[PDB]
Structure formats: C-alpha cells, structure tokens
C-alpha cells in the first residue's frame, strides 16, 4: 500500500509538472526584450551605524521608515534613529545567540529569537521608561530562524525544525502550526495584506501558507541548494528567493511556477538576504563574498553593486517608502545606502 | 506511522492539484502593469534630489 | 510616583528632596519647574541623564544647585540665597528624550514653601465659558516661530486640574500623549497654535498651559483657566 | 666653552657616503613598506600596531631627515645652510632616537604582557586609551628635547660652521649621560621582557611542535641588533667620560680620533633605525 | 540641533558609553563551545562547574569561562555553527565506551564512528580554521573493563597491539589526532579523564591560556 501511495504521489508530481508546463506559454525574460533597463545604480553610503561590537545577524525597519532594530552577538538589540545616527534604545538580551529581528507595524514591540528556541517580545513604550520583556514565547523545538509581526496581537515564527507557528501574545500559546516542510525553515516573508506568507526551508523549496486557514496553498521548487532569504514582490503575487546556488529565483503565485533566475558567473557563493525595492523593479541581494548586488527584477542583467562592507552581508532591508537600503554585515557596522 | 505521512502528502498534492493557474504571459503583464504604474514613486530607481532626501549629511 | 520636599523658612537655605518610585530614574532627565500660588508655571532647573548637562533659569543661575542620586532614586535642589520671588509649589518633573519620546509626561505632587533672548509665550485669552458638551478652543502665540529644521514644533500643552499636579495633554503639535482621551488635537503651525476640545466633561476643567521646548531657557504660557 | 675639542675628519668623509647612501636608498623602500602596512592597509584595530605605527613614523622622520647631514659633509664638514635647519636637525634626530628607543621599549613591554601575563586586561585594551598613551609617550620624547631649541649651537672654531652639540668636553654633564641613560634603562627592560618570554615559551612546552620557533628567534633578533647597534656608542662615550674624569686634562692631543670612531657608532644607531621595520613587516 | 535633539544625542552618547563598558566586560571572557556525540560524557564536564543551547558561567583563577552546550539543538548544524565562529575554543566530549555499544540502529552506525564523523565535520569546518580543540576522553575507569571484556575489533579493524589501557588509549588518541588536516593553524590537546577527576578545569585553563597567548601573538603581528 505504501508503494501505491508513492506511485500516486509521483503521478501527482508529474501532473503538477505538466500543468506548470502547459501554463508556461512564455517567459518574463522573453517579454523583457525591449523594456528600458535601469542602467547603473550608484548607491552610496549616506549613514553608517558604528555602535555594535559583534557580528550583526539581523535588522528590521520600522514602518515609519526611520527607526531600525539590529541584533548582534552580544546581548545587544540596538534601536537606531537612522536620520540622525542616534541610538534610541539598547535592549539587553538574556541570550546573546540571536539570529532574527522583528519590528512591529505599530512600533510598540520588538521581537527577537535565535539558538535559545524562544521568541522574546519587548515592549518599547512602557510607563517605566525602560524596555521590558512583554512576552516569552516557548514551544519551538529548534532554533528560531525568522519571526515577523502580523500586527500587535499575532506573530509568525519559523523554527529550526520542520514547522512554522502563528502565535498569540496575551496568551503565549500558538494559534496554529504550519507543518508541511521537510527541513530547517531558514526564511519567512509576509504578504503586504498579511493574509498569506511564504516560508523557505532546507528542502530547496518554498511553501505558500494561508494564515487564517492554516494549510499550504502552493509548493515552489527549482533551487539546487537550500534557500536562505525570501522577499515578496510589493504587488504581493510574486516572491524572490535566494539560495547557496548563487541564484536568485523569482516565482509567481498565480502561475505556481518560477519566472526568472538571476544568476551570474562571477558570483559562486550563496545569498544571505534578498529584498525588493519599492515598485518591485530592483532586487538587492546580499552575497557571501562581502558584496551586495542589485538586479533588475524584470530582466536578469545586473545593476550596480553595493560594495562597501569589509565582511559578508547578513541582512539587508529596504524602507517602506523605499528611501534607503540598510545592509547589516558581519563586521560591527551596518550601512545605509541611497 | 508509515501510512500517515504518505497519506498526508498525497492529500496535500490533491489540494495543490486543482488550483486555478493563469498563463505566465498574463501574470507577466500584471507584473509589467505594477512595475510601470508605480515607477514614479521609487526613490531608488530615480536619484531623489536633496530637497526631499532625508539622508543628506 | 514621586513626592517630598521642604517647608516654610524665613530667608534661609533649603534642600528640596524628592524620591522617585519605580520608573528607572537613571535614564530620565529631571526638571524642577515651579508655580507661584496665584501665578502660572515657570521653569527653574534641569538635570540630564547621568548628571550631564545642567541648565538653570535666568533668575536662579547662581543661587540654586540641582543634583541627583541614582542610588535610592533621589533628586535634590539646594537653594542657598532665598528671596521673596520664589515662594512656590516646586513640582518635580520627569522627562525622557529619545525620538518617539513624550517628555514632561509625569509630574510630582509638588511641595509649597513660603519665605515671608527668551521666547515669550503670550496666551492672551484667559477665561472662557465653563459650559460642558461644547467645542471650546484655546489659542497660543509665540514671539519666535518655534519650527525647527527637522520639521516638528516643540510646543507642549498641559492641563492642571484645580487641586493636583499638572498633566501633559499633547507633547508636540498634534501628538497625543498616553492616558489622555482623543478629544484633543494640536492644529498648530509656526507661531499660531490652536488646541481644541470635541466635548467637555467635568474632568476637562482646569488651567491650560503651553510650553516651548526649542531653546532651553524655556517659558510656559501663563495659563488659560476655563 | 671654546676650549672643548673638535677636530677634522680624517677619511670619515670617505667611509660615510656608502652607509649613508645605502641608508637613504633602503629607507625610501622601508618607508613605503611601513606606509603600506599602516596607511594603505586597513581593517585592524591592533593596539600593538599603534605602537608599531609610532615606531614607523619615527622611522619616517629619520629617513626623511638623514640627507641634510651629508649636505653638511660637502667638502669636509660645512653646514651649507647656516640657518634654522641647524637648530632643527639636532632636536629632530634626538627626538627621533628617543622615540625609537622608547617605542621599542613599549613594544617589548606589550609583548611581555601578551605572552607572560595574558589575563591582565592591558592586552585587550581599547584603541582610544592606547592612542592617548601614545600621545603621552610622544609628549615624553618631545618635552624633554625642547631644551635644545632655546640654546643655539651653530658655533665653530675656525670658520668651519659646524652644527653639532657633541664635543669631547664637559660643561654640565646633563644630556651626554642621559643619552647614555636611554641605553641603560631599556637594557634592563627589553632583556627583562624577551628573556622572560624566551623563558615562558620554553616553560610551556609549545616550542618545536608548531611554528613558535619563529617567534622565539624574532624577539632574540630584535634584542641582539638593539644591543650591537646601541652598545658601541655608549661604551665609547663612557670611556671618553671616564678618561676625561681620570686622565683627560686640558692637554688635548692624544684622543683626537675618538670623535670619528664615535660618529661611526652613530651611523650604527641610524642603520639600526634603518633595519627596524624589516623584522616588523615580514611576519604578518 | 534643537534642545530635544541635543538631549537625544546626549542619551545616545550615554548608551554608547554603557554599551562600550558592557562590550569590554564581555570581551574579557573566554567562550568554549561544548560539543559531543550525544549524552555520553558532557554531563560530567558540566558537573565540575563548581530549551536549546545551555550556558554555564563558571570561573577559575580570576578568569570567567562561558561554556555553551548545543547538544539539545538536534537540527542540521551547518546553518547556525557560524554563530560560534568567535569562540575561544571547542571542547569535544568523546566517550571511550562508545565502541561495542551501537545505541542507534540494530547493527550499523556505531557511536565511535559517528563521533569520528562529528569530529571530522567540526575540526575541518570552514569557520573553525584556527580555533583549537580540547577533546576529552570521558571514560577512563570504564575503558579497562571494556577492553578486558572485548578487544578493539568492532571499530578500527587494524590491530590495537594488546588489551592493556595505555597503548589502546594512545591508539584512540592518535586516530582522533590525525583526523584534522590543518595541522598548523589549529591543535587538538587530547586530555584523558574520568568521572572522579577534578583536574579537567586545570587542563581547560592551560589550553585556554595557550589559545589566548597564540591569539595575542596574532594580535601583535609576530606569530
Ligand atoms: C645628538 C646631538 C648632539 C643633539 C642632542 N641630543 C641630546 C639629548 C640627549 C639625551 C636625551 O634624552 C635627549 N636629547 N642633546 O643634544 C646631535 O645633534 N648629533 C648629531 C648626529 C647624530 O647623533 O646622528 C649626526 C651628525 C651631526 C650631529
């Protein structure tokens, strides 16, 4: 009976493959044969933030496009005013092994997590004027690799085992648990409407989950190696992933297949962070060879290179108004580019 | 525990099977419409002048 | 909370001492603004976080000395030379200064002791009808336009209910504080500022003060009692 | 004090141009290598390399301020400028030699704390206090050497316009012994440092299984070139001092050639300053 | 700058000052990543101290030691092992009772071979190019009866000489020693220990001191 189920699953995979082949009448690279290229993008370092003293592993922008969180390999989660290079907060973490950051859309809460398997949510706006651990979310088995805020009540976390969770904050138990991956869920990204989200794991595949319904909608394959970063398109119908194959890949939700492969022969090392610019034209991807390339999301040619970091880039983010790009690297400085 | 994960995987492929997929050209034209409709409000595509650039000095 | 201080003395020297209760006193700048029994509020002294920059008013520059002790969360104001001008309720104020902060948010209970250039804030209106449920507006004018280059006017509106300490209503132009209802708004730009009330209850009566925060010898607005 | 003896240069002007030209020609390349190791390179906090850079800029100043000495050696010994470079050169070379010796001393002390006392908190020190202690040491070499700026020494005996405050004589015995002192106090420091390190790495069994032997040999090399380039000057000077205290009366005819020999030892001091960064660039 | 902007800059400078003191306090503290082939001998190494990663903060001779155990992570370790790139040293726990007890499967993939594979994946990692190993052999008292009841035959099919403790333990130590490839940039120290010995902290302190003075000779540009 097990062999019959395996053969039926193989037939289903073949059916998915031929449906994707039938729906693929053309390519995006074929259509973008007469479109105007972006030219060369000259992004220079407007600000540098020289406060951390260890390797920065995460960074997240506030929705006001001004405040930054950044976590390093001390107990330090620093909140910066990026306009005036000013530290507005320095939250001391109980565990220095932090691999992720989150800034709430309201800006009240900041989440952290990492090798300590728990998600600490800090309330910034308290009557006592300090930062307090508003919540301590436990229940994940592996290391917490990514966390994103839906709103002030709910948070979606991705762990180092084959699960993702949607939690509640006033009651610290998980609202739902998404379990369809086979591998360590290394990245997680939310739609702008926050109704669906894509999680990318170590099985070289991304999955699109519905937050309210609680089950997988689509599974996207194509990557040779495990993927480390996913960002949605600003339209919300597409997303680009980056792996250790040195290839970004733009998948589309409604086509249920990949559209583009951003690759170059000069780059061979993996991709750590991927973020779209506003309107979804540029694609800033940070690599392991100390650089940060800018691709065009429509045609696979490369724009300028954000080469200013002395170590590898671990996180990169674009503001909600698209003003500037903050790249946090493995040296202690994170640089703001425009 | 041999039936359960294979059965879950096969019903997941049932639930992924009958989704409605539009053509790649149509969703590509949708991406064209979103990328060229919002291209006038992309501060990284066009170099924003110093009057409304908050990162000046 | 915070309270404590001194009492009546003829022409002597006194150390006002207030004790902070559980709001991380070492990270808060502290003001010592004072209020005469029939006049309005006025600013006296300021100690910053970690006893850094210290500021005084133009009349108490040498006579007064403001200090803090982060052990036991205690704040001192030592006055050596005492005149007949500074018989006042001395109203210790906390204020924290970061980007999204709301300074002057919490005020001490105030202790009364009897002895026996700058921006001039006018507030020419002083009395309005006390009827409830209406929409009363309170205006404010300054001498210099307190619009800074970063784009926010540093003008604050406080409510002093008759009987207790003044309470911050809005901490910029159109920046509602915490714990204040949504019936207040800033609606000011440049020099003219216009606080407005949607509906008046019995708890909205009191004296309304406007305070600039552009340059540090900061002046209040002499009150507009409802 | 015109009775103090200073005499001609019997073939000193014929044996000094080889070592002087070699010192300048190699000093250009040494300055380039030190500038590449300090200014062209980056991405190193390296609080010990602050003192290495201070030794490097002392070597920069000395390698820039050699050839006016041989502008002074045109015919036999004529300072051809006859101006404020005469009052500037003495202070420049004296403060350069003091900075080189003091900064080699603090480099040896830094390595002694690196190896023998590793849990001392002076090893992982911050760059700001290392910079202010570098400025303190530079002020130590500067503020003791200013005494030669108020006093002007362009004087000569017969129109030879000699520019040097060395003579086989005595008027106060203040700096000539103290130039001796800057050899003796580091001698009780550097050989206190390295011979402890040579002890300590021989006590902890780490030699002869890894490439510790290069670190064994390099500090010993620094110590032996330091002693063989700053010993002959000081033993010749203390021999002249004891001879003047014992037998060097006002009759001045039998020790005419000791100033020439002493000037060869001075050439040894600045070829030591030449060969300094060749053992501090070929290791990283 | 305005008044509030000046006070915010002052607050940021105070944050810079306190953060610099916190970083200087954290700098004078050695980090030991404690790895092992399951629950074999890590319990004793925690036991002479005197969720996922667990951190112990013992001290010895005025030196603060932070020891991290990640045996409860139980995931694919290549994604998070770069967080331990800046540790002072890697303590490795290998049980000498690992052979002849397979403990995972019916017949194959015994404990000594997976301990070998974990050691080879750790000492030849791309991040641990220069960190040293203070590899332990945690079963001294149990090894003699293990080699008395059974020869070293179910692993290392080559001869171990005889069934005495000294040459067999030397064979285990040598076969763990030649496993690394970068023989120059890192070293394995190979202490032998039991559940009653209290000299583990002395050997850990000695290896930590060796790593510190080698890092200092790296810092002074003379190594
Ligand atoms: C050294 C001297 C005499 C100046 C001087 N230095 C100090 C002194 C002593 C102790 C101390 O701690 C600080 N400073 N007093 O006088 C000088 O100009 N020598 C010249 C040459 C040289 O030495 O290379 C080359 C040829 C021309 C002459």
mmCIF file with all atom_site columns, N, CA and C in Angstrom, chain A residues 291-324:
data_model
loop_
_atom_site.group_PDB
_atom_site.id
_atom_site.type_symbol
_atom_site.label_atom_id
_atom_site.label_alt_id
_atom_site.label_comp_id
_atom_site.label_asym_id
_atom_site.label_entity_id
_atom_site.label_seq_id
_atom_site.pdbx_PDB_ins_code
_atom_site.Cartn_x
_atom_site.Cartn_y
_atom_site.Cartn_z
_atom_site.occupancy
_atom_site.B_iso_or_equiv
_atom_site.pdbx_formal_charge
_atom_site.auth_seq_id
_atom_site.auth_comp_id
_atom_site.auth_asym_id
_atom_site.auth_atom_id
_atom_site.pdbx_PDB_model_num
ATOM 1   N N  . UNK A 1 291 ? 29.821 41.412 -0.703  1.00 0.00 ? 291 UNK A N  1
ATOM 2   C CA . UNK A 1 291 ? 29.184 42.371 -1.594  1.00 0.00 ? 291 UNK A CA 1
ATOM 3   C C  . UNK A 1 291 ? 27.669 42.321 -1.443  1.00 0.00 ? 291 UNK A C  1
ATOM 4   N N  . UNK A 1 292 ? 26.998 43.130 -2.261  1.00 0.00 ? 292 UNK A N  1
ATOM 5   C CA . UNK A 1 292 ? 25.539 43.206 -2.281  1.00 0.00 ? 292 UNK A CA 1
ATOM 6   C C  . UNK A 1 292 ? 25.136 43.700 -3.667  1.00 0.00 ? 292 UNK A C  1
ATOM 7   N N  . UNK A 1 293 ? 24.691 42.784 -4.517  1.00 0.00 ? 293 UNK A N  1
ATOM 8   C CA . UNK A 1 293 ? 24.362 43.148 -5.885  1.00 0.00 ? 293 UNK A CA 1
ATOM 9   C C  . UNK A 1 293 ? 22.939 43.676 -5.974  1.00 0.00 ? 293 UNK A C  1
ATOM 10  N N  . UNK A 1 294 ? 22.684 44.450 -7.023  1.00 0.00 ? 294 UNK A N  1
ATOM 11  C CA . UNK A 1 294 ? 21.352 44.942 -7.342  1.00 0.00 ? 294 UNK A CA 1
ATOM 12  C C  . UNK A 1 294 ? 20.995 44.394 -8.713  1.00 0.00 ? 294 UNK A C  1
ATOM 13  N N  . UNK A 1 295 ? 19.991 43.530 -8.765  1.00 0.00 ? 295 UNK A N  1
ATOM 14  C CA . UNK A 1 295 ? 19.486 43.015 -10.022 1.00 0.00 ? 295 UNK A CA 1
ATOM 15  C C  . UNK A 1 295 ? 18.281 43.836 -10.463 1.00 0.00 ? 295 UNK A C  1
ATOM 16  N N  . UNK A 1 296 ? 17.913 43.698 -11.729 1.00 0.00 ? 296 UNK A N  1
ATOM 17  C CA . UNK A 1 296 ? 16.646 44.198 -12.235 1.00 0.00 ? 296 UNK A CA 1
ATOM 18  C C  . UNK A 1 296 ? 15.654 43.047 -12.167 1.00 0.00 ? 296 UNK A C  1
ATOM 19  N N  . UNK A 1 297 ? 14.488 43.296 -11.571 1.00 0.00 ? 297 UNK A N  1
ATOM 20  C CA . UNK A 1 297 ? 13.530 42.218 -11.360 1.00 0.00 ? 297 UNK A CA 1
ATOM 21  C C  . UNK A 1 297 ? 12.823 41.802 -12.640 1.00 0.00 ? 297 UNK A C  1
ATOM 22  N N  . UNK A 1 298 ? 12.896 42.615 -13.692 1.00 0.00 ? 298 UNK A N  1
ATOM 23  C CA . UNK A 1 298 ? 12.233 42.314 -14.952 1.00 0.00 ? 298 UNK A CA 1
ATOM 24  C C  . UNK A 1 298 ? 13.144 41.557 -15.912 1.00 0.00 ? 298 UNK A C  1
ATOM 25  N N  . UNK A 1 299 ? 14.373 42.033 -16.093 1.00 0.00 ? 299 UNK A N  1
ATOM 26  C CA . UNK A 1 299 ? 15.366 41.367 -16.924 1.00 0.00 ? 299 UNK A CA 1
ATOM 27  C C  . UNK A 1 299 ? 16.606 41.073 -16.089 1.00 0.00 ? 299 UNK A C  1
ATOM 28  N N  . UNK A 1 300 ? 17.200 39.906 -16.307 1.00 0.00 ? 300 UNK A N  1
ATOM 29  C CA . UNK A 1 300 ? 18.222 39.356 -15.410 1.00 0.00 ? 300 UNK A CA 1
ATOM 30  C C  . UNK A 1 300 ? 19.569 40.091 -15.458 1.00 0.00 ? 300 UNK A C  1
ATOM 31  N N  . UNK A 1 301 ? 19.738 41.221 -16.141 1.00 0.00 ? 301 UNK A N  1
ATOM 32  C CA . UNK A 1 301 ? 21.005 41.936 -16.099 1.00 0.00 ? 301 UNK A CA 1
ATOM 33  C C  . UNK A 1 301 ? 21.205 42.580 -14.732 1.00 0.00 ? 301 UNK A C  1
ATOM 34  N N  . UNK A 1 302 ? 22.466 42.797 -14.379 1.00 0.00 ? 302 UNK A N  1
ATOM 35  C CA . UNK A 1 302 ? 22.832 43.309 -13.067 1.00 0.00 ? 302 UNK A CA 1
ATOM 36  C C  . UNK A 1 302 ? 23.065 44.811 -13.130 1.00 0.00 ? 302 UNK A C  1
ATOM 37  N N  . UNK A 1 303 ? 22.472 45.530 -12.180 1.00 0.00 ? 303 UNK A N  1
ATOM 38  C CA . UNK A 1 303 ? 22.764 46.937 -11.950 1.00 0.00 ? 303 UNK A CA 1
ATOM 39  C C  . UNK A 1 303 ? 24.005 47.048 -11.062 1.00 0.00 ? 303 UNK A C  1
ATOM 40  N N  . UNK A 1 304 ? 24.173 48.194 -10.409 1.00 0.00 ? 304 UNK A N  1
ATOM 41  C CA . UNK A 1 304 ? 25.349 48.444 -9.592  1.00 0.00 ? 304 UNK A CA 1
ATOM 42  C C  . UNK A 1 304 ? 25.450 47.528 -8.380  1.00 0.00 ? 304 UNK A C  1
ATOM 43  N N  . UNK A 1 305 ? 26.626 47.568 -7.762  1.00 0.00 ? 305 UNK A N  1
ATOM 44  C CA . UNK A 1 305 ? 26.997 46.664 -6.681  1.00 0.00 ? 305 UNK A CA 1
ATOM 45  C C  . UNK A 1 305 ? 27.237 47.492 -5.425  1.00 0.00 ? 305 UNK A C  1
ATOM 46  N N  . UNK A 1 306 ? 26.614 47.087 -4.318  1.00 0.00 ? 306 UNK A N  1
ATOM 47  C CA . UNK A 1 306 ? 26.776 47.781 -3.037  1.00 0.00 ? 306 UNK A CA 1
ATOM 48  C C  . UNK A 1 306 ? 28.004 47.231 -2.311  1.00 0.00 ? 306 UNK A C  1
ATOM 49  N N  . UNK A 1 307 ? 29.170 47.559 -2.859  1.00 0.00 ? 307 UNK A N  1
ATOM 50  C CA . UNK A 1 307 ? 30.444 47.046 -2.358  1.00 0.00 ? 307 UNK A CA 1
ATOM 51  C C  . UNK A 1 307 ? 31.023 48.064 -1.381  1.00 0.00 ? 307 UNK A C  1
ATOM 52  N N  . UNK A 1 308 ? 30.687 47.905 -0.105  1.00 0.00 ? 308 UNK A N  1
ATOM 53  C CA . UNK A 1 308 ? 31.247 48.763 0.920   1.00 0.00 ? 308 UNK A CA 1
ATOM 54  C C  . UNK A 1 308 ? 31.518 48.073 2.240   1.00 0.00 ? 308 UNK A C  1
ATOM 55  N N  . UNK A 1 309 ? 31.264 46.771 2.314   1.00 0.00 ? 309 UNK A N  1
ATOM 56  C CA . UNK A 1 309 ? 31.354 46.039 3.568   1.00 0.00 ? 309 UNK A CA 1
ATOM 57  C C  . UNK A 1 309 ? 32.623 45.198 3.607   1.00 0.00 ? 309 UNK A C  1
ATOM 58  N N  . UNK A 1 310 ? 33.321 45.252 4.742   1.00 0.00 ? 310 UNK A N  1
ATOM 59  C CA . UNK A 1 310 ? 34.559 44.503 4.921   1.00 0.00 ? 310 UNK A CA 1
ATOM 60  C C  . UNK A 1 310 ? 34.330 43.034 5.243   1.00 0.00 ? 310 UNK A C  1
ATOM 61  N N  . UNK A 1 311 ? 33.106 42.645 5.585   1.00 0.00 ? 311 UNK A N  1
ATOM 62  C CA . UNK A 1 311 ? 32.757 41.253 5.822   1.00 0.00 ? 311 UNK A CA 1
ATOM 63  C C  . UNK A 1 311 ? 31.461 40.953 5.080   1.00 0.00 ? 311 UNK A C  1
ATOM 64  N N  . UNK A 1 312 ? 30.998 39.709 5.193   1.00 0.00 ? 312 UNK A N  1
ATOM 65  C CA . UNK A 1 312 ? 29.825 39.275 4.450   1.00 0.00 ? 312 UNK A CA 1
ATOM 66  C C  . UNK A 1 312 ? 28.567 39.953 4.981   1.00 0.00 ? 312 UNK A C  1
ATOM 67  N N  . UNK A 1 313 ? 27.609 40.163 4.086   1.00 0.00 ? 313 UNK A N  1
ATOM 68  C CA . UNK A 1 313 ? 26.350 40.810 4.429   1.00 0.00 ? 313 UNK A CA 1
ATOM 69  C C  . UNK A 1 313 ? 25.397 39.751 4.957   1.00 0.00 ? 313 UNK A C  1
ATOM 70  N N  . UNK A 1 314 ? 24.875 39.971 6.162   1.00 0.00 ? 314 UNK A N  1
ATOM 71  C CA . UNK A 1 314 ? 23.983 39.007 6.791   1.00 0.00 ? 314 UNK A CA 1
ATOM 72  C C  . UNK A 1 314 ? 22.518 39.384 6.680   1.00 0.00 ? 314 UNK A C  1
ATOM 73  N N  . UNK A 1 315 ? 22.199 40.674 6.624   1.00 0.00 ? 315 UNK A N  1
ATOM 74  C CA . UNK A 1 315 ? 20.821 41.099 6.447   1.00 0.00 ? 315 UNK A CA 1
ATOM 75  C C  . UNK A 1 315 ? 20.810 42.369 5.618   1.00 0.00 ? 315 UNK A C  1
ATOM 76  N N  . UNK A 1 316 ? 19.705 42.597 4.919   1.00 0.00 ? 316 UNK A N  1
ATOM 77  C CA . UNK A 1 316 ? 19.535 43.839 4.185   1.00 0.00 ? 316 UNK A CA 1
ATOM 78  C C  . UNK A 1 316 ? 18.043 44.108 4.080   1.00 0.00 ? 316 UNK A C  1
ATOM 79  N N  . UNK A 1 317 ? 17.679 45.378 4.135   1.00 0.00 ? 317 UNK A N  1
ATOM 80  C CA . UNK A 1 317 ? 16.279 45.756 4.149   1.00 0.00 ? 317 UNK A CA 1
ATOM 81  C C  . UNK A 1 317 ? 16.071 47.079 3.456   1.00 0.00 ? 317 UNK A C  1
ATOM 82  N N  . UNK A 1 318 ? 14.903 47.224 2.844   1.00 0.00 ? 318 UNK A N  1
ATOM 83  C CA . UNK A 1 318 ? 14.502 48.445 2.161   1.00 0.00 ? 318 UNK A CA 1
ATOM 84  C C  . UNK A 1 318 ? 13.330 49.039 2.929   1.00 0.00 ? 318 UNK A C  1
ATOM 85  N N  . UNK A 1 319 ? 13.316 50.365 3.052   1.00 0.00 ? 319 UNK A N  1
ATOM 86  C CA . UNK A 1 319 ? 12.292 51.051 3.824   1.00 0.00 ? 319 UNK A CA 1
ATOM 87  C C  . UNK A 1 319 ? 10.924 50.921 3.159   1.00 0.00 ? 319 UNK A C  1
ATOM 88  N N  . UNK A 1 320 ? 9.880  51.189 3.948   1.00 0.00 ? 320 UNK A N  1
ATOM 89  C CA . UNK A 1 320 ? 8.511  51.067 3.460   1.00 0.00 ? 320 UNK A CA 1
ATOM 90  C C  . UNK A 1 320 ? 8.175  52.113 2.408   1.00 0.00 ? 320 UNK A C  1
ATOM 91  N N  . UNK A 1 321 ? 8.826  53.270 2.445   1.00 0.00 ? 321 UNK A N  1
ATOM 92  C CA . UNK A 1 321 ? 8.731  54.249 1.374   1.00 0.00 ? 321 UNK A CA 1
ATOM 93  C C  . UNK A 1 321 ? 9.838  54.113 0.332   1.00 0.00 ? 321 UNK A C  1
ATOM 94  N N  . UNK A 1 322 ? 10.733 53.140 0.490   1.00 0.00 ? 322 UNK A N  1
ATOM 95  C CA . UNK A 1 322 ? 11.770 52.897 -0.491  1.00 0.00 ? 322 UNK A CA 1
ATOM 96  C C  . UNK A 1 322 ? 12.863 53.933 -0.530  1.00 0.00 ? 322 UNK A C  1
ATOM 97  N N  . UNK A 1 323 ? 13.077 54.663 0.565   1.00 0.00 ? 323 UNK A N  1
ATOM 98  C CA . UNK A 1 323 ? 14.047 55.752 0.553   1.00 0.00 ? 323 UNK A CA 1
ATOM 99  C C  . UNK A 1 323 ? 15.479 55.237 0.543   1.00 0.00 ? 323 UNK A C  1
ATOM 100 N N  . UNK A 1 324 ? 15.783 54.246 1.376   1.00 0.00 ? 324 UNK A N  1
ATOM 101 C CA . UNK A 1 324 ? 17.162 53.826 1.562   1.00 0.00 ? 324 UNK A CA 1
ATOM 102 C C  . UNK A 1 324 ? 17.219 52.340 1.866   1.00 0.00 ? 324 UNK A C  1
#
